[PDB]
């Protein structure tokens, strides 16, 4: 449903997540041109993105173009592939840079591959409304540049309000790290979040952040930034099996 999400509008029988606000995916006065399967739309800082049309627990792919209006003229700043991983109460976007604006001339594009995680949204779980004991185990996907085959496993101890996970099966060994134990803290809006360190070979290589989503904290979504011998970003999305 690629060419859908871009054209079709949010009607809501659709499975959730249904909408995704683009904030970190598009800057204040910049434009994000998405296209795929004979469809095309433009955004849009704050603009919504119809995800209800996309498939669940999978990566949706679109072609993209990042521009900026300079004197009544749009100037391309970057282009490549836009990725979207949707769940029931959460979702996130990623950018696979295939070409970026030259450093000397504005009108000349250069081939540069970069991967970064954009937005991480959904139905935030209230920190003040988290379970009080027990442990929820979340299984899901870990995806990086040219690899969406990563496996994510994350456990949460609501009593101790701590979390800890693991990344496996990523083509890049240096990315299959451990998500060290981290404390669940309240957001500025009192949304349950989790930030901690990332380890490879019992060695701190970076940090990770997760948001808890769904009224029953059924899901977790965020990203990891890992230092390798060549810094890489990893998209994270996991859910606890349904009853």
């Amino acid at each position: 449903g690629l060419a859908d999400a871009l054209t079709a509008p949010l009607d809501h029988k659709d499975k959730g997540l249904q909408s995704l606000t683009l904030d970190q995916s598009v800057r204040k006065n910049e434009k994000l041109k998405l296209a795929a399967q004979g469809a095309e739309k433009t955004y849009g800082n704050g603009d919504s993105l119809n995800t209800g049309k996309l498939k669940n627990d999978k990566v949706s792919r679109f072609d993209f173009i990042r521009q900026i209006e300079v004197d009544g003229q749009l100037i391309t700043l970057e282009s490549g592939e836009f990725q979207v991983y949707k769940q029931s109460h959460s979702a996130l976007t990623a950018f696979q840079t295939e070409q970026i604006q030259d450093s000397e001339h504005s009108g000349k594009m250069v081939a540069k591959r970069q991967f970064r995680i954009g937005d991480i949204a959904g139905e935030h779980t209230s920190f003040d409304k988290l379970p009080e004991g027990g442990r929820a185990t979340y299984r899901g996907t870990a995806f990086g540049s040219d690899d969406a085959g990563g496996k994510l496993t994350y456990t949460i101890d609501f009593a101790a309000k701590q979390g800890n996970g693991k990344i496996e099966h990523l083509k890049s060994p240096e990315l299959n790290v451990d998500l060290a134990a981290a404390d669940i803290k309240p957001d500025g809006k009192r949304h349950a979040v989790i930030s901690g360190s990332v380890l490879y070979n019992q060695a701190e290589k970076g940090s990770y952040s997760l948001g808890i989503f769904g009224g029953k904290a059924q899901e977790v979504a965020g990203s990891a930034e890992v230092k390798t011998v060549n810094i890489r970003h990893i998209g994270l999305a996991a859910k606890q099996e349904l009853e």
Partner: peptide
């Protein structure tokens, strides 16, 4: 910073 509000508390 990215994910500002996820990080701020730490």
């Amino acid at each position: 910073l990215y994910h500002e509000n996820m990080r701020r508390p730490y």
